């Protein structure tokens, strides 16, 4: 994450690592929405223009990690994918619309001080908290800079939500209803952004009415990183809430 700070420890227990089996390389991030399911960005799994196609076998999850490197032996959990679920109309041929995907873990995780699920917004939360100006916060082990540089530890950056029209004009790609962009404007003389490597990583907001944290979005894409006048786009987690549950309480 560009212009972030080292995550405190146990600050974002829902943060997951999506690691490709071998080469053992870090590909994206994700969240624990329960003890059996991890939510991520579809494109982490599927992106043909880049001959990207993972199956519940070339990958594996890592939960409760802090350090990007050290296998934190009595903290972290290495879990294995059971099944994957890419959104049926996840538009990779256009704007990466519906960048959502789900992974069913084989054997359930055991919540520890360092491993605990985030909540999915209910219409009321979503409705009152998804408003321009509100700040939410990203977390990832992705590149710290657009170019030239990988953290040793999880990072954070709180970015305010931007007005759709500002986002809209922010770029050439067709922005949809199932997207929000967030970041500082050029004059707010503040910066921060999620960068490449950050996908799947959660965009969470804390609630005033009850104090629970809520996955409002997912690091989808963006142009460059921390560029001026560009915003980082996020999946509208709310907006694909039914597919989320249609699949889960499915099987």
């Amino acid at each position: 994450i560009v212009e972030g700070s080292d995550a405190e420890i146990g600050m974002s227990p829902w943060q997951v690592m999506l690691f490709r089996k071998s080469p053992q390389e870090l590909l994206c991030g994700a969240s624990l929405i329960s003890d059996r399911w991890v939510l991520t960005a579809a494109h982490c799994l599927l992106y043909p223009p880049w001959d990207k196609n993972f199956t519940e076998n070339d990958l594996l999850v890592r939960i409760g990690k802090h350090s990007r490197t050290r296998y934190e032996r009595n903290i972290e959990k290495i879990s294995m994918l059971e099944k994957i679920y890419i959104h049926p109309r996840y538009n990779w041929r256009e704007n990466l619309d519906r960048d959502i995907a789900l992974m069913k873990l084989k054997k359930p995780v055991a919540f520890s001080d360092y491993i605990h699920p985030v909540c999915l917004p209910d219409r009321e939360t979503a409705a009152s908290l998804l408003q321009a100006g509100y700040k939410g916060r990203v977390t990832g082990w992705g590149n710290l800079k657009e170019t030239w540089g990988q953290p040793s530890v999880l990072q954070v950056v709180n970015l305010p939500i931007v007005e759709r029209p500002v986002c809209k004009d922010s770029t050439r790609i067709r922005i949809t209803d199932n997207m929000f962009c967030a970041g500082y404007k050029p004059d707010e003389g503040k910066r921060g952004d999620a960068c490449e490597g950050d996908s799947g990583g959660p965009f969470v907001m804390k609630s005033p009415f009850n104090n629970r944290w809520y996955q409002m979005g997912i690091v989808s894409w963006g142009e460059g990183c921390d560029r001026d006048g560009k915003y980082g786009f996020y999946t509208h987690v709310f907006r694909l809430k039914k597919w989320i549950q249609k699949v889960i309480d499915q099987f």
Partner: peptide, 30 residues
């Protein structure tokens, strides 16, 4: 799973504030 969702055990539960969680809350009152 999710019922005890979104309550970090080393914070919300110990009643500690993460070093910036506050930047977010003030962001709404204002």
């Amino acid at each position: 799973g999710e019922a005890d969702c979104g309550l970090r055990p080393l914070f919300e539960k110990k009643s500690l504030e993460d070093k910036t969680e506050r930047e977010l809350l003030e962001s709404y009152i204002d």
